[PDB]
From a paper:
VhCBP is a periplasmic chitooligosaccharide-binding protein mainly responsible for translocation of the chitooligosaccharide (GlcNAc)2 across the double membranes of marine bacteria. The chitooligosaccharide-specific SBP is localized to the periplasmic compartment of the bacterial cell wall and serves as a mobile component of the (GlcNAc)2-specific ABC transporter. SBPs share a common structural feature comprising two domains connected by a flexible hinge region. VcCBP and VhCBP belong to cluster C/subcluster IV (C-IV), members of which are specific for oligosaccharides, including mannooligosaccharides, cellooligosaccharides, and chitooligosaccharides.
Residue numbers in the entry: 1 to 61, 64 to 98, 102 to 529
Write the structure that this text describes.
Amino acid sequence: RSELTIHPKEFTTFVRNFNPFLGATNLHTTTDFIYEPLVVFNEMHGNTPVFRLAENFQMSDMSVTFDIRKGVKWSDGEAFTADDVVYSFNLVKEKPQSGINSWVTGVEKVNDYQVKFRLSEANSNVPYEIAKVPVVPKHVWSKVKDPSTFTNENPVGSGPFTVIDTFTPQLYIQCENPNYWDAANLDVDCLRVPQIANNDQFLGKVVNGEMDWTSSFVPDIDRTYAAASPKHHYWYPPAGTQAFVVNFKNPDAAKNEALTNVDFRRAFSMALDRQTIIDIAFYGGGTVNDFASGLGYAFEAWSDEKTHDKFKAYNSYNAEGAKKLLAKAGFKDVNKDGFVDTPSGKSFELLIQSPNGWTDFNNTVQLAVEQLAEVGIKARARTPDFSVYNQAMLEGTYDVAYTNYFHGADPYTYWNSAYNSALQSGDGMPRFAMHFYKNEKLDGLLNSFYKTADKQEQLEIAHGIQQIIAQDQVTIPVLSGAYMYQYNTTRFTGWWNEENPKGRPNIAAGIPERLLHVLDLKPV
Ligand SMILES: CC(=O)N[C@@H]1[C@@H](O)[C@H](O[C@@H]2O[C@H](CO)[C@@H](O)[C@H](O)[C@H]2NC(C)=O)[C@@H](CO)O[C@H]1O
Ligand SMILES: [Ca+2]
Ligand SMILES: [Cl-]
Ligand SMILES: [Mg+2]
């Protein structure tokens, strides 16, 4: 039988948790692979909707109706009906997701193959959001203990791989669903998932040809990995923004004083050599992002160039100008250590964090630390475990953090996740908006992005968002990165690549297109 060796997320050890709602404790082969979505949007191809469990959807003259494919059965033989979708959306309406429920007011079963979704506000992006919610078996989950602390070790599933073949703390094997509706399109028998804690461990394995489908950072990829075998390939199409995020609500006076000063964020930004960061840390694998709004050149067409030009000096390498701005603002060194102190005369050191084992970001931070020291800003690096890293952002105890962002077909994915202040509160919230900068006009502009179908007005919305973020230098954007993807042609063929660019190729959870991707691979 064919086994596909994948690596969607680093772990020290595997805990048997296949619950789709628990995205902080589950295995990252649960969404898509076990619970197939209604629709997959091919974001690389203009969000073209690829229909799976749903046959179609129809916005009413305004709310949506989904039609659900017939003859579709769960893993245990029981049939997939509207009742299963109905029971699923119903369940998060009274037990909160991460997806966000701020868009759907209840659900009607209307037909055992048609479901009515009632809308809170009106949003043309709402099928994209509905697609994120996992549909679970009604005939199974309606039992359940506490649906919130429920490991799902033996999962009833709709997706391609539902059988747990093997399960050690360093290896688990996830095999073909017995009653899979698309099994005719499926030629991979099993997902084979090894436990890998960080990039150093990954690197030995990938260079030894032990992997099939991976998305980790690989330093000097052409020398280390590609040169080791003719079967060793990769394809890095462009992805989203990377930046230093600063905490506007730091609990230390001096640090708060520094971080909340726009002069100081702009001097911080100007000391950075973004091209050198790309060159050394990412081995050339990226593009300088000198948009103060973090827009990035892939969305250059969306850009109000007046705004970009106006603030780009603040987002270009200019240590001398960084030194002058610090002095004009009042960050004077008054204790003879060569490091500027706050206007009220306090010494400080910024602690800059990135996740343990994400060595590309670790190196970016260490590069920035030295760059900062050159213009007299004192900083130190920290590389905590992702969960610690993430937690420090959620509770606002960090100073400065290097982070990447998710990336969409337009700039809304980046701008909303990164700046909508409503995403600063909750408890299943991601790290992305946790600078705690807040602007009602910015939030209003974001909230109205998909409110009108006037492309011209949507574009004026973008320019208004761009201007607000840029003039306030809310973060320090550094670069635009790549979709890291490595593939082995030793055991399989049919891979997406530069010659076959059918969509986002990565294996990470959060890329629904990985389902469509595995449906193209054939054993060799
Ligand atoms: C936007 C986001 O949070 N994406 C996450 C990915 O960055 C992350 O993958 C890891 O990214 C690091 C930084 O570039 C790499 O150093 C690292 O190799 C890579 N790890 C893997 C297994 O791909 C993944 C997984 O941690 O989570 C994504 O959500
Ligand atoms: Ca000093
Ligand atoms: Cl800009
Ligand atoms: Mg196929």
